[PDB]
A paper describes a structure:
The regulatory cluster consists of three genes, aioX, aioS and aioR, which encode a periplasmic-binding protein (PBP), a sensor histidine kinase and a response regulator, respectively. Arsenite-bound AioX is thought to act as a ligand for AioS, the sensor histidine kinase that upon auto-phosphorylation, phosphorylates AioR, the response regulator, which binds to a conserved sequence upstream of a RpoN promoter. AioX exhibits a typical bilobed structure of the PBP type II class. In this class of proteins, the ligand-binding pocket is located in the space between the two domains.
In the initial single-wavelength anomalous diffraction (SAD) electron density maps generated from the crystals of Se-Met labelled protein there was an unaccounted electron density in the putative ligand-binding region near residue Cys106. The electron density was consistent with the presence of a phosphate ion, from the crystallisation conditions, and its location would suggest that Cys106 might be involved in binding arsenite. The crystal structure of the phosphate-bound AioX was used to solve the structures of the apo and arsenite-bound forms of the protein by molecular replacement. On the other hand, a phosphate ion found in the binding site of AioX formed AioX-specific hydrogen bonds with Asp210 and Cys106, which in PhnD correspond to Asn175 and Gly65, respectively. The presence of a phosphate ion in the binding site of AioX leads to the hypothesis that the phosphate ion mimics arsenite binding. A comparison of the X-ray structures however, indicates that while AioX can bind phosphate, the resulting structure does not stabilize the 53–61 loop conformation seen in the arsenite-bound form. Furthermore, even though the structure is similar to the arsenite-bound form, with the main conformation of Tyr88 akin to that of the arsenite-AioX, electron density for residues 53–61 are ambiguous and due to the disorder, we were unable to confidently build a model for residues 55–57. Within region 55–57 the structure had more similarity to the apo rather than the arsenite-bound form of AioX. As we were unable to detect any binding interaction, based on the conditions used in the ITC we estimate that the Kd for phosphate would have to be greater than 2 mM (data not shown). As AioX and ArxX did not bind phosphate in conditions tested in ITC, we conclude that AioX and ArxX do not bind phosphate under biologically relevant conditions.
Author numbering: 42 to 56, 59 to 304
The structure:
């Protein structure tokens, strides 16, 4: 009858030195949780989210958009803090020397999105379009998914995309780690503030021991040297407890896109 895995499984999607950060995060969570934690990476948000929703992961770091989409099947564990707050923006980016004044001038672009289930890499911009009565197929000459925010930036930097939609946290971090790459882009539009991508758990595992230990591992990550090392590399400050109401601005956009679709 019970169908337990051999280990605690923590899901995420892809993170420059990503192996170094992943190793440390895996070792930290193992050290904190008190037993082996395996990091399970999948390429897309809906793949990580479905694994979580089916109880095939004990927790996962997902986007607020899929979190709110599967809100009744999932519980929030903790939210990251960046620049002192559990919030971030979507940046609509163009080439550094592109002469244009605003978003409306991106009509006819080739546009790079990150993932159809990304708040900052799809939804926010999809909201801009829907508010103006258009979809990506109508407004742009082409759009595609890069399946990563670093890739959106590279797509715009290289000229394959005229414009892109990116996580503004990612853009700011890369500005410091790959400055010559990010200097080939510039921020055309910054969105409003949304809840930072949270760690969530299947709603059935609410009071489970693995979830409780994961949660403390996140909230106490600043109190251990290896935990601090992970936070430093991600340029994050820690994790805090939030409730679903922190994600209301995301749900509101989801509804605009539906209402107006």
């Amino acid at each position: 009858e019970p169908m337990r895995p051999g280990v605690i499984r923590f899901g995420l999607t892809p993170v420059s030195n990503d192996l170094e950060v992943l190793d440390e995060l895996q070792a930290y969570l193992t050290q904190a949780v008190g037993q082996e934690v395996q990091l399970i990476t999948q390429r897309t948000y809906q793949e990580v989210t479905a694994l979580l929703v089916s109880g095939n992961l004990e927790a996962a770091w997902i986007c607020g958009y899929p979190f709110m989409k599967f809100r009744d099947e999932l519980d929030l564990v903790a939210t990251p803090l960046w620049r002192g707050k559990p919030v971030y923006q979507s940046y609509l980016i163009v080439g550094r020397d592109r002469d244009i004044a605003g978003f409306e001038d991106c009509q006819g672009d080739i546009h790079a999105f990150s993932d159809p289930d990304s708040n900052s890499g799809y939804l926010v911009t999809k909201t801009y379009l829907a508010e103006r009565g258009v979809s990506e197929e109508g407004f742009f000459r082409k759009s595609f998914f890069t399946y990563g925010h670093r890739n959106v930036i590279r797509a715009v930097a290289s000229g394959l995309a005229d414009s892109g939609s990116v996580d503004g946290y990612v853009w700011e971090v890369m500005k410091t780690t790959e400055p010559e790459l990010v200097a080939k882009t510039r921020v055309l539009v910054k969105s409003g503030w949304h809840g930072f991508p949270p760690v969530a758990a299947a709603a059935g595992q609410r009071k489970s021991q693995a979830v409780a230990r994961i949660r403390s591992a996140l909230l106490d990550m600043n109190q251990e040297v290896l935990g601090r090392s992970v936070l430093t590399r991600l340029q994050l400050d820690g994790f805090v407890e939030t409730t679903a109401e922190s994600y209301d601005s995301i749900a509101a956009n989801m509804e605009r896109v539906r209402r107006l679709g």
